[PDB]
Amino acid sequence: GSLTEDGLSYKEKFVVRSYEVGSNKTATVETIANLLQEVGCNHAQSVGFSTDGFATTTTMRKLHLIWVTARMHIEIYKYPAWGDVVEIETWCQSEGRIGTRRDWILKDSVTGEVTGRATSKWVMMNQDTRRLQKVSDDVRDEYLVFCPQEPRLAFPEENNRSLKKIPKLEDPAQYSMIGLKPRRADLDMNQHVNNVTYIGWVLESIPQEIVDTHELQVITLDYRRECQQDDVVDSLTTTTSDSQFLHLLRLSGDGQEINRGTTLWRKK
Amino acid sequence: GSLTEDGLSYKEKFVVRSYEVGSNKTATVETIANLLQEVGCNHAQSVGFSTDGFATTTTMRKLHLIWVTARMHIEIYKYPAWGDVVEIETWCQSEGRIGTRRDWILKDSVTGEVTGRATSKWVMMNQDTRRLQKVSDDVRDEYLVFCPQEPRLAFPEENNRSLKKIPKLEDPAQYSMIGLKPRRADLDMNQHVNNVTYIGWVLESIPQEIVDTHELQVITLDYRRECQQDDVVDSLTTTTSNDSQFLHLLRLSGDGQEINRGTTLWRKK
Ligand SMILES: Nc1cnc2ccccc2c1
Ligand SMILES: Nc1cnc2ccccc2c1
Ligand SMILES: Nc1cnc2ccccc2c1
Ligand SMILES: Nc1cnc2ccccc2c1
């Protein structure tokens, strides 16, 4: 792909592959999430940041500081069929001392219509202590020149689905998938579990009949803790209602929370 | 991509993606196997066959007959780095009434050098009864016009690694990864476990130290039985050997029913 005319956003076109589609011959939400991650990487490379998924500056590298996803929000109107070309436009925006935001717009290359949109909140943390730091003055001036100065939101709606608090699921869960482990294909270049894997694990506890009669429209996911290579996960789901669900990912042993989220599904 | 000038082979270029690489900053063998599957699907579409992974004709669809992988053989000399463009050329060849063969050649787009090669054996079977059958003349004549008439082998060698019999691993296995289950991302459009998942499951029992100090050079995998969506798998490995060789076994964690058997060859980095 390439940076747009103003150098404040990045665009890339993707053809949907045969192994990237589900039972309804269209891309899965995990395929979409992978393409957003890929276009975010190419945007970070096109302007000089690191490309390991942390988008760091030389200053951030010296201080052992990385960017970590705290929240992901995805809304899909139409999943592209295999062979279809999808165009994704992405940009970053500063959210003061709290962190950074990356937004995406998905379009049909042939019609030009918006078929999806995503937003994500990123926080700064020490890679070793796993702490959390306010965006310091020195670090923000290094990335602000690559962000639009006026607000540019994929989800502009005054107080919408991406800014609501997610509650903690109470036991007993209605549905569950237990004993979920990552394999080497679930790890990234830094040997950490890929963020898309957690989306897949959340969806493992959705009953088969929902998957067979409904299409996933919205997904909001909070990232509270990372699952290590040798950890085992339990995926929990309860219907809160269209069909809505509350989700919970937690360590199979102690029940330590790793993720919490919500999904909205539409009848086919 | 596109069919070549003679319409007897297909070529496609792929850029390596950020999520497609491993710890060495290069594509994994599972990424490669996925790209071979993708280029095979585009070749089947470019000449009118089905695109569900079974590459069927109207005659085969009428008889509930599909093509299934019996063996996969992959040899990688250089794994492409992310951002690198890899060009894959694929073609089919008839192997009499036994079945068909699909071959691949992987190249560096910039240098033009061969960085890998693969071969696979496919058998014809009834979708429902799961019973294999020898290719009839009516079925053979429908695909022969899309195959080179002279033999065209990715592995031409007098006695090569892709035609050797794989023995059954004996208990106790040296290494093992137990309780492996497929998720929805491991299923294809027909809700069957993707063939690349079995390659990943085989490699789950290779010790971390080998993965950290060696690079996978050769992998030969036999597909004896399919793992169902609700099945659990056990992955077993024993060292059989500057190079490291292993014997592999995938089997159902319950009854110990065999699903796959294979061999891997690794070279020191
Ligand atoms: N409607 C969809 C889309 N993508 C999915 C991805 C993983 C699991 C279930 C899904 C259902
Ligand atoms: N805080 C950041 C991080 N990475 C970026 C990559 C491209 C453009 C703007 C960015 C801002
Ligand atoms: N050297 C390699 C290449 N690809 C792999 C894929 C899956 C697991 C281990 C691997 C090791
Ligand atoms: N037996 C088959 C199946 N699919 C093919 C696709 C393209 C060219 C030749 C083929 C032969």
Swiss-Prot record, chain B:
Name the record gives this protein: Oleoyl-acyl carrier protein thioesterase 1, chloroplastic
Enzyme class: hydrolase
UniProt keywords, alphabetically: Chloroplast, Fatty acid biosynthesis, Fatty acid metabolism, Hydrolase, Lipid biosynthesis, Lipid metabolism, Plastid, Transit peptide
Record's catalysed reaction(s): (9Z)-octadecenoyl-[ACP] + H2O = (9Z)-octadecenoate + holo-[ACP] + H(+)
Source taxon at top rank: Eukaryota
Subcellular location: Plastid, Chloroplast
A single GO BP: fatty acid biosynthetic process
MF annotations from Gene Ontology: fatty acyl-[ACP] hydrolase activity
Residues of the full protein shown: 75 to 359 of 362
Gene Ontology cellular component terms for the protein in this record: chloroplast
Enzyme nomenclature, EC number: 3.1.2.14
Active site as annotated: N190, H192, C227
Biological role stated in the UniProt entry: Plays an essential role in chain termination during de novo fatty acid synthesis. Possesses high thioesterase activity for oleoyl-ACP versus other acyl-ACPs. Substrate preference is 18:1 > 18:0 > 16:1.
Family of the protein in this entry: Belongs to the acyl-ACP thioesterase family.
